[PDB]
Amino acid sequence: EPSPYVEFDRRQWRALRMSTPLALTEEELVGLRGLGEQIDLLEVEEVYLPLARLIHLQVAARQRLFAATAEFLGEPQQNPDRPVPFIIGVAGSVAVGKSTTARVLQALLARWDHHPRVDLVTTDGFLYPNAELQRRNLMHRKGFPESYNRRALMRFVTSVKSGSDYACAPVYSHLHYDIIPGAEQVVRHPDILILEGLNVLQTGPTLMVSDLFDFSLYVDARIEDIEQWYVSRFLAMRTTAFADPESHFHHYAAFSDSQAVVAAREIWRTINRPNLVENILPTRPRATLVLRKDADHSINRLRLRKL
Amino acid sequence: EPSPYVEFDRRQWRALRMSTPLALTEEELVGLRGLGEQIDLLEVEEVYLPLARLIHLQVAARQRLFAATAEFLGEPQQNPDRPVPFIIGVAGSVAVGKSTTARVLQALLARWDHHPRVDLVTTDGFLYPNAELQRRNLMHRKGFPESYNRRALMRFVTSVKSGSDYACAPVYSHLHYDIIPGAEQVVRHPDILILEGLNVLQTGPTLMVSDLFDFSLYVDARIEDIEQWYVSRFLAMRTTAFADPESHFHHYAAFSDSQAVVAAREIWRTINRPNLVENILPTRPRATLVLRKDADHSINRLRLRKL
Numbered sequence: 262e263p264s265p266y267v268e269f270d271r272r273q274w275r276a277l278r279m280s281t282p283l284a285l286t287e288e289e290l291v292g293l294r295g296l297g298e299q300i301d302l303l304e305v306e307e308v309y310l311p312l313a314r315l316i317h318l319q320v321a322a323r324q325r326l327f328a329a330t331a332e333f334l335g336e337p338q339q340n341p342d343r344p345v346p347f348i349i350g351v352a353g354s355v356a357v358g359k360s361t362t363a364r365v366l367q368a369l370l371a372r373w374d375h376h377p378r379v380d381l382v383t384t385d386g387f388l389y390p391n392a393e394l395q396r397r398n399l400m401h402r403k404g405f406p407e408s409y410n411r412r413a414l415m416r417f418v419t420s421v422k423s424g425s426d427y428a429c430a431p432v433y434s435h436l437h438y439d440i441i442p443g444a445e446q447v448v449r450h451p452d453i454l455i456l457e458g459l460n461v462l463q464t465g466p467t468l469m470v471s472d473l474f475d476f477s478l479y480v481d482a483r484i485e486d487i488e489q490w491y492v493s494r495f496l497a498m499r500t501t502a503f504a505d506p507e508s509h510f511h512h513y514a515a516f517s518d519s520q521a522v523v524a525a526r527e528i529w530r531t532i533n534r535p536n537l538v539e540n541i542l543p544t545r546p547r548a549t550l551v552l553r554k555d556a557d558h559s560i561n562r563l564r565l566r567k568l
Numbered sequence: 569e570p571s572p573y574v575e576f577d578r579r580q581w582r583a584l585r586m587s588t589p590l591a592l593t594e595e596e597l598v599g600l601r602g603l604g605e606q607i608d609l610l611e612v613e614e615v616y617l618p619l620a621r622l623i624h625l626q627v628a629a630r631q632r633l634f635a636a637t638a639e640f641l642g643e644p645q646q647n648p649d650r651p652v653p654f655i656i657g658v659a660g661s662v663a664v665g666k667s668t669t670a671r672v673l674q675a676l677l678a679r680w681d682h683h684p685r686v687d688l689v690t691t692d693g694f695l696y697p698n699a700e701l702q703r704r705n706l707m708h709r710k711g712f713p714e715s716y717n718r719r720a721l722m723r724f725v726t727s728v729k730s731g732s733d734y735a736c737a738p739v740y741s742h743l744h745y746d747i748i749p750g751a752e753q754v755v756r757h758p759d760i761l762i763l764e765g766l767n768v769l770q771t772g773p774t775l776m777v778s779d780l781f782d783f784s785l786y787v788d789a790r791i792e793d794i795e796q797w798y799v800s801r802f803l804a805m806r807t808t809a810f811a812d813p814e815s816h817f818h819h820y821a822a823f824s825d826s827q828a829v830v831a832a833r834e835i836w837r838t839i840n841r842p843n844l845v846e847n848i849l850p851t852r853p854r855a856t857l858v859l860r861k862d863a864d865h866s867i868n869r870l871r872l873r874k875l
C-alpha cells in the first residue's frame with residue numbers, strides 16, 4: 262500500500278551521509294548533551310550528518326518557494342544577505358532527548374561551509390509565569406498546551422520568519438522553576454531557527470507555529486523507556502541540580518532512592534505521561550523525520566516524510 | 569504587527585494577472601457554473617487568471633522540494649513525463665460556490681500552454697452510503713467530518729501523490745442522495761489534482777489529506793449571506809433538480825415559497841450551519857488563499873498566505 266513515509270534502519274540511513282564533514286569534537290558534543298544522554302560522535306556521524314545534509318538540500322529548495330510567491334507578487338529579489346529564515350521544530354516527550362537533539366542539530370548546521378546564523382529557541386521561555394499558572398489553576402499542567410502563551414510564541418516565530426530585524430522571547434529558569442523577570446533572548450534575522458519544545462507540532466483552530474515549520478523533528482521512544490529515563494534522571498539530579506540550595510526542588514536532594522522513585526513515578530503518571538499521550542504523540546504523524554530510540558537511548562530507526 | 573497573510577482588493581489582485589491568456593469562452597464558463605452563481609468572464613480575468621498564474625509559478629517550485637529529497641536519498645531523477653502530482657484543496661461551506669470555483673480552476677489550469685493533466689475529485693464520493701450512515705446514526709450529519717470515509721479518502725490522495733498509475737474513488741449521486749453502487753472515477757497520474765469538499769482542510773491525530781496539499785483554496789463569505797444563498801437556491805431547485813420524479817427530494821418540488829423557506833432554514837440551522845461553524849470555518853486560517861465574496865457572490869477581497 263502507498264505511504265507518505267519511508268522507514269530506515271541506522272545502516273540504510275548512515276549511507277545517505279555521503280561525504281558530509283564531521284565538524285564537532287568530543288569536548289564540544291559533551292557540552293551539548295544532557296544528563297542521561299548516550300549520544301556519541303558515532304551516532305552524530307551515522308544519524309545527524311545525513312539529517313544535516315538533507316536539511317541543507319531543502320533550505321535552498323524551500324527558498325525557491327517564497328521566491329515564486331515573490332515573483333508572482335511582482336516584488337523585488339531578496340537581499341541574499343537576508344533570505345526567508347528556515348524554521349525547524351523539534352518535538353518530543355519530557356526526557357526523551359529532544360533538547361540534546363536540537364542542541365546538536367544547531368551545532369552542526371551552524372558549522373556549515375558558509376556559516377549560517379543558526380538560532381535555537383526552546384518553548385520554555387513561553388510558559389506562563391508560576392503566578393499566572395496558579396491564577397489559571399495550571400501549576401499542575403506545566404507543559405500542557407494551555408500552560409504556554411501560544412500567542413506570544415506565534416507572534417515570535419511569525420516575527421522572525423517574516424523578516425524582522427530582531428524578535429524577543431522570555432527566558433525560563435529551570436533552577437527557579439519559573440520565568441525570569443526582565444530576561445530576554447534576542448534573535449536577529451537568523452538563516453535558520455530551531456524551535457524546541459513539548460507541543461511545537463501542535464495544530465488547531467488558528468494558524469500555529471507548526472504551520473510555519475519548513476522542517477520538523479520528533480524524537481521518539483517507547484513510553485515505558487521514557488518513564489525509565491525520566492525516573493532515572495530524577496534520581497541522578499539529586500546530586501546535580503537539586504543539590505544546589507538555590508534550587509526550587511532542593512528538598513528532593515534528600516530523598517532516598519525509594520522515595521525519589523515514588524515521587525518521580527507520580528509526577529510522570531499525573532503529568533508528563535498524560536501530556537505525552539494526549540498532546541505530544543498525536544502530533545508525531547506530522548513530523549518530517551522521526552528519530553526512534555531504543556531503550557538504550559540509541560537512535561536505530563528513522564521515519565521520513567517523503568509526502 | 570507581522571503577519572503570515574497579505575490582504576488584497578480586486579484592484580490590487582487583478583494587476584498580478586500580467587499577460588495570462590484567457591482561454592475560456594462564455595459558453596464554457598456557463599457549463600461550469602452552478603445554480604445561483606454570478607461568476608462571469610470578468611471575475612475570471614481579474615481573479616482566476618492571477619490565481620492560475622501563482623499556481624503554475626509554484627508547481628515548478630514545489631517540484632524543487634521533492635527533487636531535493638530525491639537527491640538526498642541518492643535516487644534517480646523523475647520521468648519528467650511523470651513528476652509528483654500537485655495537490656490542490658478547495659474548501660468552503662455548502663452553497664458558497666466552491667464547487668464552481670474548483671470547476672473553473674480545473675478548466676483554466678488544464679488549458680495551460682503545455683496542457684497538464686488536471687483531475688478534479690469532490691469528496692462527495694467518499695461519504696458513507698446512506699445505509700452505512702443510518703447504521704452509525706449519521707443520516708442527519710451528512711457533510712460532517714465523521715460522515716466521510718476519511719481513510720479511503722486519505723488512501724486515495726496518498727495513492728495519487730505517491731506516483732501510482734491510477735487510483736479509484738466512489739461516485740456520489742445528488743439525484744439519489746447516495747453513493748452509486750459500482751461506480752468509479754479513475755484518476756491516472758495527473759499533473760495536478762484538485763480535491764473539493766466541505767472539510768478538506770481538516771487536521772487531526774493522524775496524517776490527513778490536508779497534509780498532502782501543495783496549495784489550498786477557501787471560498788468565503790458571511791454566514792448569513794451563505795444562508796441566503798442556500799435558501800434561495802433550495803427554492804430554485806423546485807423547478808430544476810426536485811422537479812425530476814427520480815429525485816430523492818421530489819416531494820420538495822410541491823412546497824410553497826413559504827414552506828420551502830421554512831424547510832430550507834431548518835436544514836441550514838440543524839445541519840449546514842453547525843458544520844460550517846464547528847468544522848469548516850476553523851480550517852480557514854490554514855488556506856493558502858481565501859476568496860472573500862460579498863452578498864452578491866462577487867469576489868472582491870482575497871487573503872494570501874505568504875508564510
Ligand code: NA
Pocket residue numbers: 355356
Ligand atoms: Na526537561
Ligand code: NA
Pocket residue numbers: 360383384385457458
Ligand atoms: Na526544554
Ligand code: NA
Pocket residue numbers: 662663
Ligand atoms: Na451542494
Ligand code: NA
Pocket residue numbers: 667690691692764765
Ligand atoms: Na460537492
